[PDB]
């Protein structure tokens, strides 16, 4: 019985420890996946407006080249 | 044997403001923290010390933390009548709220302040000879109440493991809802937190709103009216921890007698009597009368019909002029009524407790000071009606992906919305499985 | 704490925007000298949302005034509150755009935009927590329409996590004879669809019809039209300027009002609208939801409401308001999408506007707003089919395709509004 009693308290400890680690792990990847997403959701949003400056300069360039009366 | 309260968002903070005001009046603590009746200065093992710490100067400081992502709400506390009661480090505020967005409260704005909140919590814990668990007050619907609370619950599971966490949640109500996306925030927080909370007491604002109108003749209730009434339920539950008595429950006891299965941990509270001073006048109510009032659907705290479900466990907390003989007879009658159905796997289905300190009313309130009152915490399958209503509202919007962009713009993926909804689908199924009669 | 930076471009933006500051300054007890002459302490609880504080307890609007015709600037300085505006926040041009969108967006506005952003940067750095920007401007002119949308894109570039709100005034043949207005509007809508979180559509065709049909002004003036806008603008911003918890800041408003990012064009409404030569809660409620009180020239009963925000002002029975909002919603069930539960939100402010005892402002995201964009696409395509006046724009560097893309994108937006107007729950 005393052997069983030690096996039981040890299980309880292993129960708690696994709860912490599944928690710690699940939180860490979910905050990391989220980081990637919001980075890419900004990275591409401002690569969206380099095309709007590469086009802003393109327009202003086509005017001066039209000023060649 | 100590508990730490955490109040999150406007709803949690403003609820705590009412609860701690009531605690001080119940224990005779003045707004400056002094309790004259306490003769053990700077410390003690008194029952009220489970919720109050002490300083050498005789001050009694709540073992609480207030957190909001914008300072408007907590600043009232910092300047209100009870400003001296709390140490400045206990009150924590950011500068930009979560904008009714779970994602902002969990990822974008929440992460900015989570570490500070845990550090202040840890300083409270280090002031403990033995810590039972945490009491978390918040709202399902707000951006901070849902998003940040879920982050805090997950972090608490790491720093403290299986230590008890109990929630007091505010179920959305259109009567006072200030957000269209509240269904999204509630399904997401429930799913994220579902495996971290050992017991969650939901309060439907609509139920409180109707009770205040009907029982207290309040023609157009306000959060102040509602919050005081919530405080009575919170006071009754904590009364067994704050007041010294032989017939008390503690966090471990009534958890062990209310929750049959880990996911089935959502009881609905009922309080009685809720009466106005005019009607109380020349009208005193018996133990049996308030006991019967707990099973009447009108007095419930979540809009649902327990008659159309089955009880799995009832916890009856009496306080005031209550004698054991009266309590035993009242519960004896309930066990004869067939309109009150218990599952067939719960023969013994009543946890009972008595505290002898009478209920207290804040001055200027609407509730009458009664001699005896009772709070019943019942785990009935009828609560699933609440999940069904909120899941349907989730489905209507999600079918068209309405408002989802605000959440994706803050980093989330559509997967989290289906993942969370499937979890609610399983929970709705679990609540019907447990209600089926055994083979 | 929650600070908003106001910007106003063009003659229209500066005149409707000048009235805005006269009205709200009165509501908060601020006189043209920037001093507080008020009685109740709710006038200052949130004064810092729109006003900077300086030494001597003087309040200065957080405003930036812009135009490519310097004459405009003097007009504001001479106005009733012209001396309250911080003088360095005036950013004037040289010549004027001549109702040419391309000049304001690409050529003359571009050379001036960087000077504006410097004032923007100075104002934003003195904010404890900036929440966003609001722009007042017209879509028919050349400066507010072209340079306004450019300033939006450049601000979003430098402050991409703040809310961009606009009060955009929309051309009408009934109010101005300029022939290229359909071009400028269709080009600005193409911009505002991508770069603003929420846009209050002010339509002069609706303002003129209200001034003529309801107020019996046979010859309305911009002073008459702008009296309507100032009442609307004061109403749709009172949740932001006074204590409350419904749509209290610009982002919380956007999250309740914008189910889809492109469908952020609102239909403002105000009540009452009574002639000087001629009120209960049930009446206010019915009037708000009447088409004749909409500042956009669209009939909400020709479409469906995705979301609605109603603001009540004055001393009144809150219980009476709750009933009437419930009554009007379920008496008009068919005009609210069934797949967005509880999409009508109601706020109440104790302080009424000047001159009235009870006011009601209406903010509606309705699929009927497509009637307006269809009016403009009709006018736009009428001239683009023949390429009339198109040399004004290609001469500044633009290509004909930017016009087709702006045309097609507006037509896509109209098609999108119809998609959700016809959507079912099951
Ligand atoms: N019972 C009660 N409910 C409240 C109270 N305040 C807000 N609520 C509810 O909380 C929900 C909205 O969440 P809030 O608490 O206001 O928001 P928050 O927690 O501060 O988070 P943010 O919106 O990001 O600031 C709604 O369903 C309200 O009905 C309150 O004082 N008492
Ligand atoms: N309601 C109202 N509309 C105006 C006002 N001023 C101009 N508009 C409208 O604005 C459009 C023309 O734009 P303007 O503001 O005059 O032009 P701008 O933005 O100053 O640009 P440029 O004059 O070309 O340099 C027309 O459709 C007019 O009807 C005003 O004071 N009130
Ligand atoms: Ca003591
Ligand atoms: Ca003491
Ligand atoms: Ca005119
Ligand atoms: Mg808040
Ligand atoms: Mg016991
Ligand atoms: Mg001009």
Residue A53's φ and ψ, nearest 5 degrees, are: -95, -40
Does domain B383-439 correspond to CATH entry 3.40.50.720?
Answer: no
- Do B268-382 and B383-439 share a fold? no
| Number of helical H runs and strand E runs in chain C | 15, 12
Q: Tell me the C-alpha distance between C389 and C181, whole Å.
A: 11
Please, are residues B345 and B311 in contact by the beta-carbon 8 Å criterion?
no
Structure tokens of B82? 């009870």
How many angstroms does the Cα of residue C211 sit away from the middle of ligand 6?
A: 41
Residue C60's φ and ψ, nearest 5 degrees, are: -120, 130
Q: Mapping DSSP to helix (H, G, I), strand (E, B) and coil, where does residue B205 land? A: helix
Neighbours of B164 (CB within 10 A): 18
| B130 is annotated as contributing to ligand binding | no
Give A39: exposed, middle or buried? Use CB within 10 Å, 0-12, 13-18, 19+.
exposed
Q: Mapping DSSP to helix (H, G, I), strand (E, B) and coil, where does residue B236 land? A: helix
CA A4 to chain centre: 46
Q: Chain A interface, mutation test: which of B161, B163, B407, B415, most A Cβ atoms within 10 Å?
A: B161
Pairing of strands C58-61, C51-54: antiparallel
Q: Which of A24, A35, A41 sits opposite B409 (nearest CB)?
A: A41
Q: Indicate the helix (H) or strand (E) that contains B213.
A: helix B205-216
Q: Indicate the helix (H) or strand (E) that contains C347.
A: strand C344-349
Q: Tell me the C-alpha distance between B404 and B410, whole Å.
A: 10
Experimental approach: X-ray
Choose among C328, C252, C333: nearest CA to B178.
C252
Choose among B183, B274, B162: nearest CA to B221.
B274
Q: Tell me the C-alpha distance between C295 and C372, whole Å.
A: 11
Structure tokens of B333? 């009658």
Contacts of C180 (CB under 8 A, 6+ apart): C99, C100, C101, C383, C389, C392
Q: Structure resolution in Å? A: 3.1
How many angstroms does the Cα of residue B239 sit away from the middle of ligand 3?
A: 18
CA distance A41 to chain B (A): 7
Q: Which residues are paired to C170 by β-bridges?
A: C203
Q: Tell me the C-alpha distance between C166 and B47, whole Å.
A: 59
CA B279 to chain centre: 28
As residues whose CB is below 5 A from the ion ligand 3, the structure lists B 38, 40, 44
Helices in A48-66 by DSSP H: which ranges? 56-64
Q: Do C343 and B403 touch (CB under 8 A)?
A: no
Q: What residues does each domain of chain B span?
A: 1-267, 268-382, 383-439
Choose among B416, B215, B398: nearest CA to B296.
B215
Q: Tell me the C-alpha distance between B306 and C301, whole Å.
A: 42
Structure tokens of B160? 């403290």
Choose among C344, C358, C396: nearest CA to C282.
C358
Q: Tell me the C-alpha distance between C189 and C181, whole Å.
A: 12
Active-site annotation holder among B76, B154, B253, B289: B253
Please, are residues C361 and C295 in contact by the beta-carbon 8 Å criterion?
no
Which domains, ranges and CATH numbers included, belong to chain C?
1-259 (3.40.50.1440), 260-368 (3.30.1330.20), 369-423 (1.10.287.600)
Give yes or no for residue B301 CB within 6 A of ligand 1.
Answer: no
The residue assigned the tokens 């609509």 is B206
Which domains, ranges and CATH numbers included, belong to chain A?
1-67 (6.10.280.30)
Residues on chain A bordering chain C, Cβ-to-Cβ distance under 8 angstroms = 42, 45-46, 49, 52, 56, 58-63, 66
Instruction: Using the atom order of ligand 1, give the atom closest to the CA of residue B205.
Output: 1
CB under 8 A, 24+ apart: contacts of B285-288: B285/B370, B285/B372, B286/B326, B287/B318, B287/B322, B287/B323, B287/B326, B287/B327, B287/B330, B287/B372, B287/B374, B288/B326, B288/B329, B288/B330, B288/B333
Structure tokens of C50? 């729109």
Choose among B9, B22, B425: nearest CA to B238.
B22
Instruction: Using the atom order of ligand 1, give the atom closest to the CA of residue B230.
Output: 1
How many angstroms does the Cα of residue B105 sit away from the middle of ligand 6?
A: 10
How many angstroms does the Cα of residue C69 sit away from the middle of ligand 8?
A: 6
Structure tokens of C353? 């506007």
The residue assigned the tokens 């409260």 is B105
Pocket test for ligand 2, best of C93, C138, C147 (most atoms within 8 A of CB): C138
Residue B202's φ and ψ, nearest 5 degrees, are: -90, 145
Pairing of strands B350-355, C63-67: unpaired
Pocket test for ligand 1, best of B18, B100, B141 (most atoms within 8 A of CB): B141
Q: Do C252 and B96 touch (CB under 8 A)?
A: no
How many CA atoms lie within 13 Å of B305's alpha carbon, on the beta-carbon side? 3
Pairing of strands C129-138, B350-355: unpaired
Which CATH code of 3.40.50.300, 3.40.50.170, 3.30.1330.20, 3.30.420.40 fits the domain covering B268-382?
3.30.1330.20
Q: Tell me the C-alpha distance between B68 and C32, whole Å.
A: 38
Chains that touch B (3 or more CB pairs under 8 A): A, C
CA C75 to chain centre: 22
Q: Tell me the C-alpha distance between C308 and C36, whole Å.
A: 34
Contacts of C164 (CB under 8 A, 6+ apart): C132, C133, C135, C152, C155, C156, C195, C196, C197
Neighbours of C295 (CB within 10 A): 26
Q: Tell me the C-alpha distance between C358 and C271, whole Å.
A: 9
Q: Chain B interface, mutation test: which of A11, A15, A20, most B Cβ atoms within 10 Å?
A: A20
Chains that touch A (3 or more CB pairs under 8 A): B, C
Helices in C106-262 by DSSP H: which ranges? 108-125, 148-158, 181-195, 204-209, 222-236, 238-241, 250-257
Structure tokens of B299? 């007095």
| B145 is annotated as contributing to ligand binding | yes
Q: Indicate the helix (H) or strand (E) that contains B252.
A: helix B251-258
Q: Tell me the C-alpha distance between A30 and B415, whole Å.
A: 12
What is the spatial order of strands in the sheet that C2-9 belongs to?
C90-92, C63-67, C2-9, C129-138, C163-170, C198-203, C265-271, C358-366, C305-314, C344-349
Structure tokens of C78? 């001479």
Q: After which residues is chain C broken (C to N over 2.5 A)?
A: 278
**What residues 125-184 of chain B have any CB closer than 8 A to a CB of chain C?**
174-175, 177-181, 183
Helices in C28-78 by DSSP H: which ranges? 71-78
CA B185 to chain centre: 18
Which CATH code of 3.40.50.410, 3.40.50.300, 3.40.462.10, 3.40.50.1440 fits the domain covering B1-267?
3.40.50.1440
Q: Tell me the C-alpha distance between C46 and C34, whole Å.
A: 16
Choose among B117, B116, B172: nearest CA to B142.
B172
Q: Tell me the C-alpha distance between B312 and B423, whole Å.
A: 22
Q: How far apart are the first and last CA of chain A?
A: 104
Give yes or no for residue B170 CB within 6 A of ligand 1.
Answer: yes
State how far the alpha carbon of B263 is from the alpha carbons of B133, B348, B428, C308, in Å.
19, 21, 11, 37
**How does DSSP classify residue C70?**
T
Sign of CA dihedral C361, C363, C367, C373: positive
Q: Do B101 and C255 touch (CB under 8 A)?
A: yes
Q: Is B278 a catalytic residue?
A: no
Structure tokens of B217? 């003749």
Please, are residues C151 and C182 in contact by the beta-carbon 8 Å criterion?
no
Q: Mapping DSSP to helix (H, G, I), strand (E, B) and coil, where does residue C407 land? A: helix
Pocket test for ligand 2, best of C79, C96, C169 (most atoms within 8 A of CB): C169
State how far the alpha carbon of A61 is from the alpha carbons of A58, C145, C419, in Å.
5, 22, 40
Give the residue on B whose Cα is nearest the Cα of C322.
B175
Instruction: Using the atom order of ligand 1, give the atom closest to the CA of residue B139.
Output: 10
Give C275: exposed, middle or buried? Use CB within 10 Å, 0-12, 13-18, 19+.
exposed
Q: Do C255 and B179 touch (CB under 8 A)?
A: yes
Q: Tell me the C-alpha distance between C316 and C314, whole Å.
A: 6
Sign of CA dihedral C311, C312, C314, C320: negative
Structure tokens of C39? 């009685």
Give A60: exposed, middle or buried? Use CB within 10 Å, 0-12, 13-18, 19+.
middle
Q: Do A62 and C153 touch (CB under 8 A)?
A: no
């Amino acid at each position: 019985k005393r052997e069983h009693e030690r096996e039981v308290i040890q299980k309880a400890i292993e129960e708690n420890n696994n709860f912490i680690k599944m928690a710690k792990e699940k939180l860490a990847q979910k905050m990391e996946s989220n980081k990637e997403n919001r980075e890419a959701h900004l990275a591409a949003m401002l690569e969206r407006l380099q095309e709007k400056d590469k086009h802003a300069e393109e327009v202003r360039k086509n005017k001066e080249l039209k000023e060649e009366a | 044997r100590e508990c730490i309260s955490i109040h999150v968002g406007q709803a949690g903070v403003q609820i705590g403001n009412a609860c701690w005001e009531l605690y001080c009046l119940e224990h005779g603590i003045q707004p400056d923290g002094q309790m004259p009746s306490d003769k053990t200065i700077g410390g003690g093992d008194d029952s009220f010390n489970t919720f109050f710490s002490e300083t050498g100067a005789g001050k009694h400081v709540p073992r609480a933390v207030f957190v909001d992502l914008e300072p408007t709400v907590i600043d009232e506390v910092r300047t209100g009548t009870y400003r001296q009661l709390f140490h400045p480090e206990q009150l924590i505020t950011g500068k930009e709220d979560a904008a009714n967005n779970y994602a902002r409260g969990h990822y974008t704005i929440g992460k900015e302040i989570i570490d500070l909140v845990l550090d202040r919590i840890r300083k409270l814990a280090d002031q403990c000879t033995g810590l039972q668990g945490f009491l978390v007050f918040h709202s399902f619907g707000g951006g901070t109440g849902s998003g940040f609370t879920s982050l805090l619950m997950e972090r608490l599971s790491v720093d403290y493991g299986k230590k008890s966490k109990l929630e007091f949640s505010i179920y959305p109500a259109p009567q006072v809802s200030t957000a269209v996306v509240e269904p999204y925030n509630s399904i997401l927080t429930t799913h994220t937190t579902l495996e971290h909370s050992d017991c969650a007491f939901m309060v439907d604002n609509e139920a409180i709103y109707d009770i205040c109108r009907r029982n207290l003749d309040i023609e157009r209730p306000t959060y102040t009216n509602l919050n005081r009434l919530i405080s009575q339920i919170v006071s009754s539950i904590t009364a067994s921890l704050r007041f010294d008595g032989a017939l008390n429950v503690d966090l471990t006891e009534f958890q062990t007698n209310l929750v049959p299965y880990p996911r089935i941990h959502f009881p609905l509270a009922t309080y009685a009597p809720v009466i106005s001073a005019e009607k109380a006048y020349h009208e005193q109510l018996s133990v049996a009368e308030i006991t019967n009032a707990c099973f009447e659907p009108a007095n419930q705290m979540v809009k649902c019909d327990p008659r159309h479900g089955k009880y799995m466990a009832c916890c009856l907390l009496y306080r005031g002029d209550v004698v054991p003989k009266d309590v035993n007879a009242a519960i004896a009658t309930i066990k004869t009524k067939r309109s009150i159905q218990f599952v067939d796997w719960c023969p013994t289905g009543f946890k009972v407790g008595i505290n002898y300190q009478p209920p207290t009313v804040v001055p200027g309130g609407d509730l009458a000071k009664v001699q005896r009152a009772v709070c019943m915490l019942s785990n009935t399958t009828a609560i699933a009606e609440a999940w069904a209503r909120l899941d349907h509202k989730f489905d209507l919007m999600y079918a068209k992906r309405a408002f989802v962009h605000w959440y994706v713009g803050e980093g989330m993926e559509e997967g989290e919305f289906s993942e969370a909804r499937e979890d609610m689908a399983a929970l709705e199924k679990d609540y019907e499985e447990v209600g089926v009669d055994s083979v | 704490m929650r600070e908003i930076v106001h910007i106003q471009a063009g003659q229209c933006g500066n005149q409707i925007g000048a009235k805005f500051w006269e009205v709200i300054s009165d509501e908060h007890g601020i006189d043209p000298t920037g001093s507080y002459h008020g009685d109740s302490d709710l006038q200052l609880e949130r004064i810092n949302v729109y006003y900077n504080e300086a030494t001597g307890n003087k309040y200065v609007p957080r405003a930036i005034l812009v135009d490519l015709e310097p004459g405009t600037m003097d007009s504001v300085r001479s106005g009733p509150f012209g001396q309250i505006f911080r003088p360095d926040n005036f950013v004037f041009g040289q010549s004027g755009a001549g109702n040419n969108w391309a000049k304001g967006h690409y050529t003359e506005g571009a050379e001036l935009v960087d000077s504006v952003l410097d004032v923007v940067r100075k104002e934003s750095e003195s904010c404890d927590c900036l929440q966003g920007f609001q722009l007042t401007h017209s879509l028919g002119g050349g400066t507010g329409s072209g340079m306004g949308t450019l300033l939006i894109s450049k601000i979003r570039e430098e402050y991409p996590d703040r809310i961009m709100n606009t009060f955009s005034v929309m051309p009408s043949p009934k109010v101005s004879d300029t022939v290229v207005e359909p071009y400028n509007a269709t080009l600005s809508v193409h911009q505002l669809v991508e770069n603003t979180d929420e846009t209050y559509c002010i339509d002069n065709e609706a303002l003129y019809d209200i001034c003529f049909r309801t107020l019996k002004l046979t010859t309305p003036t911009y002073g008459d039209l702008n009296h309507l806008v100032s009442a609307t603008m004061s109403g749709v911003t009172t949740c932001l300027r006074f204590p409350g918890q419904l749509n209290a800041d610009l982002r919380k408003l956007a999250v309740n009002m914008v189910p889809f990012p492109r469908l952020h064009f609102f239909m403002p409404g105000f009540a009452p609208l009574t002639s000087r030569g001629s009120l209960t809660v049930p009446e206010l409620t019915q009037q708000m939801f009447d088409s004749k009180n909409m500042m956009a020239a669209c009939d909400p009963r020709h479409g469906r409401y995705l979301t609605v925000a109603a603001i009540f002002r004055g001393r009144m029975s809150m219980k009476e308001v709750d009933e009437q909002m419930l009554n009007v919603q379920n008496k008009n069930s068919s005009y609210f999408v069934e797949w967005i539960p509880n999409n009508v939100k109601t706020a109440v402010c104790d302080i009424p506007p000047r001159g009235l005892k009870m006011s009601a402002t209406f903010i509606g995201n309705s699929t009927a707003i497509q009637e307006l964009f269809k009016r403009i696409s009709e006018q736009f395509t009428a001239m683009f089919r023949r390429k009339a006046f198109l040399h004004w724009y290609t001469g500044e560097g633009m290509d004909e395709m930017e016009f087709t893309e702006a045309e097609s994108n507006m037509n896509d937006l109209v098609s999108e509004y119809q998609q959700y107007q016809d959507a079912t729950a099951d």
